[PDB]
Design a protein around this ligand. Structure first.
Ligand SMILES: [Zn+2]
Ligand SMILES: [Zn+2]
Lengths: 91, 135, 191, 76, 95, 118
RNA sequence: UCGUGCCCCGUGUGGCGAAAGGGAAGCCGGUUAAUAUUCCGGCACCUGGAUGUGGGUUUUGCGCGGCAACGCAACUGAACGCGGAGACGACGGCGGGGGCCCCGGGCAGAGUUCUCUUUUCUUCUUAACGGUCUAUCACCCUGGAAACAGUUUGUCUGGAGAU
RNA sequence: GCGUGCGGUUAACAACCAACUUAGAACUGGUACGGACAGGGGGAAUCUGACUGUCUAAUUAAAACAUAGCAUUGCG
């Protein structure tokens, strides 16, 4: 049963701080509180412990990540061009 | 094919003898009533011979070349088998299932294992079996 | 805070080959927006091993082997002199001079881009996070990748308490009173 | 304080050199008897059902060891 | 193609899914093929490769994760390593 | 009956070193008893799990108990758990075997290079 | 012993700073006009030192048992190292234990009692220190789970092996 | 008193034990029934500061200050 129309997790803030600010903070709270799939063990147990720190409850691996998501698109693209540059250098 | 046969060298991974090297005297793949799982009767080294340098006396070398053996019924899950083999004629049927049911039979079997292992160590062969694992 | 976030001192192993370390912990440093990584290396001169504290790049994890030296590979978390990387590589904690253990590109989500190399004079042109162009000695080191914790400033603080919690461990002056709200003896803007 | 359950160990304790005194406590409501021997570190108590043989244990006890019966009132 | 071969082995042949059953199959020596997922821990991967080398069993390094290997086997659970004991009507052994 | 109690020491504040529990005496009186902090279970050096078989005491209490109560009869016993010891054994064996394999491969490549040069 | 030397090692520098932080160890009963975990009686503990007896180990020199988790009164261990404890936020509900509160019976004592009230009230206790048998988490063995299962108030767990 | 090989899910039955809530009905006193105590008056609007918070101890508690958000400047 859906209890709110649009505020979602931002409903804890009530009428304070402004609608646009609550909507802006909602994305970060949803991504920072979601559970993620571990790239090491495959279980859905990776959660944030501090800002930029993501640990898996099952295999106990701790990974340096984004502030509110596990990976940032800049770092994913950086990994891609790093692989490209390494292939160019080796070849 | 099967590799857990007689003369197979394994590493014990659990229990009091964890990290020790053993040789399989007898494989019991189908298990028994006492041990209803794939297991093995093995003989191994509890205390390894010490390192021998070129300036030691004969008495000190003889003191440091002593081997303390042990015998064990061990689960297959608590063994890490290796590609090395150790074939000793003196260890043929040195232990069996009811050896472990009587303390004096264990002592006589350990005496035989100690004698055979010390002969093989003094031969200079199979140095990997008599050096301890570092972990 | 326990230790500063610095590279290893530039020694013979980093100057001529590579030395391997293991990442043991990724920890939160109060007052800093980026996580730190505790890495253990061997001492080449004694039996005891040495624990270092690096700024953690994104994608680094516990139990990972990283490599510091001239002959280290081009992988995230490795520490290389700028002459050992190609153009277009982004790096973190870039030394201004070879041996000061890191000066440039240290905060969360930031990096320094290797624009080019001048091998005759042993110089490297780099682009800083502010957009500035700098020339450094080519023996200056850097850690491959982007500093972890990026996107921190996107979330609104939303609360005076959250600002207070941010600046209490940072020692920065908070709250800020406007100079125009003061008397003429307190501020030049006073009155 | 330590319970002794073996009569042989109680006899060796009573023959120890540091056994300074001993006493007999009779609990007739529970029908039991307690032999308490004071040694250096510990007081050792042996608990028995009251019987004739429980009385003759005092004869097997050493003679030089002073043995006293505990009275009904502990006068200060 | 390896997914189609795997589906054929699940339909016709005999497999065991999982680390302990795979090790038991390798110890028995009746295992015909071993499949190891990409994200299997390197220690377990080296252990499985050593067991398969000692039993002379071929090893296929599946490029997917354990989630993908379980989906390829047709299960709703992950699987880091598995053993094919009977090929059935598939030609997965001929490679 | 008087049910209220007092501290028996001169610290009046509810600090972590001022823990009390309520007892009833053979004199029929309600009283406090000052107690120490709870002992902490020793933990594995590799994974951090609580080690089975080891008592949880304050640190100086371990000097009063004998050696077999403070350890497990195994390598790294009382310092690392059995799963971590098994992992150490398997990893050590496999890595030294791989070192032998790599040394064989390097010798073969060196011999091939020497034959090509000669 | 060329007798009046040689070798090894690297880490730096000391002190003050908390009767609420950290920290070796004591409980009960009694006792004074006034002190008491301090006195008395009983029963204990900690730290350090010396050196015996018993028991243990060893002629297979430095214990044995359990597949294992691990157990047992012992059961060698310098340099140099690794690790654990000390040692840690706030808040929420849930479960275990002590003490308090509440209820019923019984013995003993007290009060009420024109009438009623098998009544109303009071004592009925068990310390430190030890022994023994047990107590959520977790870990081990067998085995291999879809017709998915186990399971909390709160949906987490399981082929990386659940029930 | 334990081991198997079975067989059956109407135990949907018996025995014993236990506590506080909730709903419904009749009867009955009444000047009162949250009987003392405890315990929002409410509504239509305007101006004003976003809000929580803070200051003139001993005449001013506020449209003052702070705040999150926004914008500018300097520094490799
Ligand atoms: Zn994981
Ligand atoms: Zn562990």
């Amino acid at each position: 049963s859906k209890r709110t129309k649009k505020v979602g997790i931002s409903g804890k803030y009530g009428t304070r701080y402004g609608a646009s600010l609550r909507k802006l903070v909602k994305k970060q709270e949803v991504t920072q509180h979601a559970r993620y799939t571990c790239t090491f063990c495959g279980k859905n147990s990776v959660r944030r412990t501090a800002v930029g720190i993501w640990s898996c409850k099952s295999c106990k691996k701790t990974m340096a990540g984004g502030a509110y998501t596990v990976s940032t698109p800049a770092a994913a693209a950086m990994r891609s061009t790093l692989r490209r540059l390494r292939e160019i250098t080796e070849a | 094919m099967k590799f857990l046969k007689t003369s197979r060298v394994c590493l014990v991974t659990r229990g009091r003898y964890a990290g020790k090297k053993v040789v399989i005297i007898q494989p019991v793949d189908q298990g028994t009533k006492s041990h209803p799982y794939g297991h093995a009767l093995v003989a191994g080294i509890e205390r390894y011979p010490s390192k021998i340098t070129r300036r030691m006396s004969k008495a000190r070398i003889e003191k440091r070349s002593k081997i303390k053996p042990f015998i064990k019924v061990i689960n297959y899950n608590h063994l890490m088998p290796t590609r090395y083999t150790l074939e000793l004629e003196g260890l043929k049927a040195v232990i069996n299932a009811d050896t472990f049911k009587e303390p004096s039979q264990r002592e006589e079997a350990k005496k035989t294992v100690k004698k055979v292992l010390e002969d093989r160590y003094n031969s200079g062969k199979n140095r990997w079996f008599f050096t301890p694992l570092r972990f | 805070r326990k230790a500063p976030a610095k590279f290893r001192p530039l020694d013979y192993a980093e100057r001529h080959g590579y030395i391997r370390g293991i990442v043991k912990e990724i920890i939160h440093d109060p007052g800093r927006g980026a996580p730190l990584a505790r890495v253990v290396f061997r001492s080449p001169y004694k039996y005891k091993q040495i624990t270092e504290t690096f700024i953690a790049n994104e994608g680094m994890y516990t139990g990972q082997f990283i490599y510091a030296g001239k002959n280290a590979a081009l992988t995230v978390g490795n520490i290389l002199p700028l002459s050992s990387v190609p153009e277009g590589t982004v790096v973190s904690n870039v030394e201004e001079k070879p041996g000061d253990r890191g000066a440039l590109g240290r905060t969360s989500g930031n990096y320094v881009t290797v624009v080019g190399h001048n091998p005759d004079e042993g110089k490297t042109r780099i682009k800083l996070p502010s957009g500035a162009k700098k020339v450094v000695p080519s023996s200056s080191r850097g850690m491959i990748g982007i500093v972890a914790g990026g996107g921190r400033t996107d979330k609104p603080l939303l609360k005076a308490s959250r600002a207070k919690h941010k600046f209490a461990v940072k020692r920065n002056r908070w709250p800020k009173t406007r100079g125009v709200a003061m008397n003429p003896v307190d501020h030049p803007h006073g009155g | 304080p330590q319970e002794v359950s073996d009569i042989k160990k109680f006899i060796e304790i009573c023959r120890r050199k540091d056994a300074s005194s001993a006493r007999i406590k009779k609990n007739p409501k529970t029908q039991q008897i307690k032999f308490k021997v004071r040694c250096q570190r510990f007081l050792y108590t042996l608990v028995l059902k009251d019987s004739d043989k429980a009385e003759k244990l005092k004869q097997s006890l050493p003679p030089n060891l002073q043995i006293k019966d505990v009275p009904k009132r502990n006068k200060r | 193609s390896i997914g189609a071969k795997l589906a054929l082995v699940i339909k016709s042949g005999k497999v065991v899914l999982g680390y302990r059953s795979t090790l038991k199959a390798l110890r028995s020596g009746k295992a015909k093929l071993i499949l190891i997922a990409a994200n299997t821990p390197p220690l377990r991967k080296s252990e499985l490769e050593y067991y398969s080398m000692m039993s002379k069993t071929p090893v296929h390094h599946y490029s997917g994760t354990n989630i993908e290997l379980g989906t390829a086997c047709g299960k709703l659970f992950r699987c880091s390593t598995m053993a094919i004991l009977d090929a059935g009507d598939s030609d997965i052994l001929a490679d | 009956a008087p049910t209220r109690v007092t501290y028996r020491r001169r610290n009046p504040y509810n600090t972590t070193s001022n823990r009390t529990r309520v007892i009833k005496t053979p004199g029929g009186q309600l009283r406090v008893l000052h107690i120490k902090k709870r002992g902490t279970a020793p933990k594995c050096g590799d994974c951090g799990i609580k080690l089975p078989g080891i008592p949880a005491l304050r640190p100086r209490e371990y000097a009063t108990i004998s050696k077999p109560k403070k350890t497990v009869q195994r390598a790294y016993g009382g310092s690392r758990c059995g799963n971590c010891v098994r992992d150490r054994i398997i990893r050590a064996f496999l890595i030294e075997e791989q070192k032998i394999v790599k040394k064989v491969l390097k010798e073969q490549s060196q011999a091939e290079k020497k034959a090509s040069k000669k």
